[PDB]
Every structure is written in C-alpha cells, then in structure tokens.
Design a protein around this ligand. Sequence first.
Ligand SMILES: *[C@@H]1O[C@H](CO)[C@@H](O[C@H]2O[C@H](CO)[C@@H](O[C@@H]3O[C@H](CO[C@H]4O[C@H](CO)[C@@H](O)[C@H](O)[C@@H]4O)[C@@H](O)[C@H](O[C@H]4O[C@H](CO)[C@@H](O)[C@H](O)[C@@H]4O)[C@@H]3O)[C@H](O)[C@H]2NC(C)=O)[C@H](O)[C@H]1NC(C)=O
Ligand SMILES: *[C@@H]1O[C@H](CO)[C@@H](O[C@@H]2O[C@H](CO)[C@@H](O)[C@H](O)[C@H]2NC(C)=O)[C@H](O)[C@H]1NC(C)=O
Ligand SMILES: *[C@@H]1O[C@H](CO)[C@@H](O[C@@H]2O[C@H](CO)[C@@H](O)[C@H](O)[C@H]2NC(C)=O)[C@H](O)[C@H]1NC(C)=O
Ligand SMILES: CO[C@H]1O[C@H](CO)[C@@H](O)[C@H](O)[C@@H]1O[C@H]1OC[C@@H](O)[C@H](O)[C@@H]1O
Ligand code: CA
Length: 475
Amino acid sequence: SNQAKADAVKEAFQHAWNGYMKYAFPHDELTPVSNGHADSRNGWGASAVDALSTAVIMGKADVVNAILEHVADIDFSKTSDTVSLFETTIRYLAGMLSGYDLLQGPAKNLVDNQDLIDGLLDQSRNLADVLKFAFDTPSGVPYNNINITSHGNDGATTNGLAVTGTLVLEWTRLSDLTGDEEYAKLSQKAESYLLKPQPSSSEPFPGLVGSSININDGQFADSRVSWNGGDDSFYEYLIKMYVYDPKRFETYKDRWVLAAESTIKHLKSHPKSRPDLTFLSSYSNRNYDLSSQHLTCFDGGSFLLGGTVLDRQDFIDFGLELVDGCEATYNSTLTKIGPDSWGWDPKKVPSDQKEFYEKAGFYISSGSYVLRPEVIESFYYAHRVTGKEIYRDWVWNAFVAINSTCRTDSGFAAVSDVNKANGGSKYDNQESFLFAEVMKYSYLAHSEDAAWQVQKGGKNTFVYNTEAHPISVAR
Ligand SMILES: *[C@@H]1O[C@H](CO)[C@@H](O[C@H]2O[C@H](CO)[C@@H](O[C@@H]3O[C@H](CO[C@H]4O[C@H](CO)[C@@H](O)[C@H](O)[C@@H]4O)[C@@H](O)[C@H](O[C@H]4O[C@H](CO)[C@@H](O)[C@H](O)[C@@H]4O)[C@@H]3O)[C@H](O)[C@H]2NC(C)=O)[C@H](O)[C@H]1NC(C)=O
Ligand SMILES: *[C@@H]1O[C@H](CO)[C@@H](O[C@@H]2O[C@H](CO)[C@@H](O)[C@H](O)[C@H]2NC(C)=O)[C@H](O)[C@H]1NC(C)=O
Ligand SMILES: *[C@@H]1O[C@H](CO)[C@@H](O[C@@H]2O[C@H](CO)[C@@H](O)[C@H](O)[C@H]2NC(C)=O)[C@H](O)[C@H]1NC(C)=O
Ligand SMILES: CO[C@H]1O[C@H](CO)[C@@H](O)[C@H](O)[C@@H]1O[C@H]1OC[C@@H](O)[C@H](O)[C@@H]1O
Ligand SMILES: [Ca+2]
C-alpha cells in the first residue's frame, strides 16, 4: 500500500520535473498552461534549487546531478530585479544548505560529485556575502527589499515580523558550517528585538507581538497580532531554533511557550454554526477578526512539534484541533481542496453562502488554491507525532485531489475556485514550492523511516526550514 503510494508521489514529481526541464530550465519556473517560462525569483533557477532536497530524499540521482551542475554556474551577484531577503533566504540559501547536509550525511552514497557537493556550501557563502548589507542598519533590523547592485532599498521605515524573524535558522547554520560567526551575529541581532518586545503596548498578550518593527531603533510600530501571512513563520522558528540547538536557544523556546499559551487562551475561536470546529482569529486593540488563511494552517504542525518535544499533551491536543479545522476546509468543497481564505463571523455570512456556512462552519472569501503546502504539512506532523493512520490518509486524499484537479500536460497549475468542477479555471503559474514542499511532505507521509523524517520527543537529528528544506541539527 504505502510503497505504491510513495511511488505514485515520485511519479507526479517526475511529471512536473520533465515539463520544467523541457520548457523552462534554467529560468525560475514553468508556466504550466502555456508551456513556457517565468522568472519570479531573480533568474537563478528557483525551481531547480528548491527541488534538490526533495530529489535527494526520493533517491533520484539523475535529477540531483543535473541540479548540482546548475548550482556551479549560478552568479548570485547579478540579476535585473529587486531582491527579497526573506524569499531568497528560505528558498535558495536553505535549499543549497539542506542539499549539502543531506548529501554529506544520510545520503552520502547517492552520487559521486564531491567537488559539486562541496560547491553547495561555497555558493551558500557567496549568496550571503552578496545579501548581508541588508542588515547594515541603525538597529540591525534589515530592509527586506534591496537592490544588490546599488545597495539601495525601497524606502521603507519598518520591516515585517515574519520577514524579520524567519532568517536565523539559515544564517546561523551557515556560520556553524563555515566558522565565520558573522552570519549568526547579524541574524541574531535582528531577532533580539522580537524576543524582548518594546514598547510593552506592542505585546498585548504574553509572547504575542505586533506586525511591524521600525528599522532605525528596533521598536514595534503596531499592536496587531495574528498567525496569518506577514506574521506566521516568526512563531514557527522560535521552537525550531530550540530543536536546532537546545543549549544555545533555550530562550527562544521560552518565548514560544508564552506565545502558545496566549494563543490557546485568546485567539482560539469556534464558529457559531459548528461549535465543534476550531480556527485561530486575529486581534487588534481589543477587537477579534473572525477569518483565516490557508497560510495559517502551518499552525497545527507547530503546536504538534513543540508539544512532542516538550512532552506537553495540552499542546499536542490543541494542534490536533487546528488540524481538524483545516481538514474541514478541504473536505467541504467539491474538489476536496481547501480555499485560500475564509471567515466565520455570524454577522457577515454572505446571503448566497448561508446554507453552506450553516453546515460547513465557514463561508469562502477567496476560492483559489495556489499549490500551497501548509495543510498537508500539518497533517504530516500529526501522523508522525500520534502514529495514527487517519492523518496519513488525509495527506493521500489531498494529494490525489491536487493531481486530478491541477495537473496539465507539463506540470501542475494553480486554480481559481476549489468549490467548482475542475477547479474553475487554471492560472498559468507553478511556484517552486510545488517541488520543495507539496511533493516532499506527500512522499514522506508514505515513505520509509530515516533520519530526515520528523521524530518524537528529543529524537530529531534534522529540523525543517519554512520551505520544507531539512537542516542537520547543531554539533
Ligand atoms: C472531514 O473533516 C472533519 C473535520 O476535521 C473530520 O471529522 C473528524 O475528524 C477527527 C477524526 O479523527 C475527529 O477527532 C477525533 O474525535 C474523537 C471523538 O471526539 C468527540 O467526542 C469527544 C467526547 O469526549 C469530544 O471531546 C470531542 O470534542 C468530539 O465531539 C476523539 O476521540 C479523537 O481523539 C482521540 O484520538 C486522538 C488522536 O487522533 C488522541 O490525541 C486523543 O487522546 C483521543 O484518543 C479525536 O479528537 C473530529 O472530532 C471529527 N471532526 C468533526 C468536528 O466531525 C472528518 O473525518 C472528515 N471526513 C472525511 C470524509 O475525511
Ligand atoms: C539597481 O540599481 C542600479 C544602479 O546601480 C540600476 O541600474 C542602473 O539603471 C540606470 C537607469 O536605467 C541606468 O542608466 C544605469 O546604466 C544602470 N546601472 C548599471 C551599472 O546597471 C538598476 O536599474 C536597479 N535595479 C532595479 C531592480 O531597480
Ligand atoms: C495522477 O495523474 C496521472 C495523470 O492523469 C494519473 O496517471 C494516468 O492514470 C490513468 C488511469 O486512470 C492511465 O490510464 C494513464 O496512462 C496515466 N497517465 C500517466 C501519464 O501515467 C495518475 O494515476 C494520478 N495519480 C494518482 C495517485 O491518482
Ligand atoms: C507572501 O506570503 C509568503 O511570504 C510571507 C512574508 O511576506 C510569509 O509570511 C508567508 O508565510 C508566505 O511564505 C510562505 O510561502 C510559501 C513558501 O514560500 C513557504 O512555505 C513560505 O513559508
Ligand atoms: Ca512555510
């Protein structure tokens, strides 16, 4: 059963790789409907670099070698577009480092190209040296949007919470591997202002903080709290940094615990029509916004990871409740794939979605699905933490619906409406995380145990970055 399902995920990954190689490589991505190419990530070949960790884990040597040869020719000092410090760090930097850790460790006998493997660290070092000026600010909090040729930026006065707090794993791993502590120092200095938030009005509940930080002095600029896009991964990385090295980052763990408890006490929310469902709300100056995003569903997985690592059953229980809410948004639509955004405010239910809200527990705000991985990700952690078969089955059901609804002759496409036959209309877009995250979590849910799988308690020897790239844990 499981070997056949695993082989089926490898087939769908191969399908998209063949199309990408055929019509777009070395550009950043395949345009799956017109069978063409696009470059949304600076032209360095994002889909190829994001696919490396997944191909190694699946044991596809031919795909691995092709990517290793490509990395060697990249020139990270040149590009015709502005550069995102956040996106460049989580996809390219983490993708090369993960490949290096996997090929230097658990998969050391998959290929013979030691010089090309060694070059994965060389190019990671090269990439950070081109990006580091972003941190050379008064406070140390970086400008996320920069011009790597001029060294200029977009003129912003504040940097977002997630884009500021989702860098420490990759940049610190680079120092540990190289020996040059500069990378860890820069990223940890930026993180410092988030662990000891000021002014206190910016931290409404213990551990839950505002959404923007002033670049000149490190003080927060607002008091809006949420686990949605723009905020999410800051909380994700607090507990993950503890798994990376519990000695060095015990402080990060303490701050996550406060965030987890405050979230269970204040942001938890049950729809009036379906009290047995749980979603997280957002908060701003005493008012609760009753809506969420597909992005937010990484939440169940975080509570499950922190819960098993800290032997806290109440965190494991809450993570499963969030996992059930997200599975409800998926299994309530016609395609069996969930919406990008939704709501449950009893006072704002759309007249045309009345019957639906009443039975499902929510009304849809945006019905598109852009090949996102967060729901399958949290189902994957639920399976690894509890060992229960139902969560594996939910990963399989979601994978089959994506393969039936989104597949084209060359790859997979984003769709406009998950509650209409065939997804409504396909968008000419295939993001690189299709390769890095959707295909990897779907395969791991069905594949053999190994050091790269997520583990229980204090047994993890690898920790996943926010783009599903596993990093070897410290020392
Ligand atoms: C479409 O999505 C649905 C929504 O996610 C999904 O529904 C179910 O999903 C879960 C299936 O496992 C289910 O969760 C379980 O519920 C068990 C029963 O709980 C009920 O009764 C107790 C009474 O004491 C109440 O406390 C609960 O609130 C609830 O009313 C529960 O026993 C179980 O917990 C055990 O197992 C977990 C590990 O799985 C352990 O950690 C725990 O200690 C227990 O041993 C778990 O909570 C969920 O309740 C249910 N959702 C709803 C609202 O219906 C559908 O399955 C899905 N449909 C399809 C086609 O896939
Ligand atoms: C990044 O900044 C560089 C400046 O160093 C911009 O390139 C210059 O653009 C001007 C305006 O068209 C040209 O006249 C110069 O010849 C360019 N200089 C060089 C050496 O290329 C570039 O446009 C900026 N990039 C982005 C994405 O805005
Ligand atoms: C994912 O989609 C592919 C393409 O539709 C499925 O493969 C096809 O399956 C049919 C049987 O229904 C065969 O007749 C075709 O020859 C297959 N085509 C190819 C290119 O292999 C595949 O079965 C789907 N995967 C899962 C797990 O459902
Ligand atoms: C635009 O959304 C992405 O970037 C935001 C920051 O501007 C993040 O807060 C948000 O989580 C999101 O990042 C995920 O996007 C999909 C994949 O690249 C990864 O899973 C990112 O975590
Ligand atoms: Ca993520």
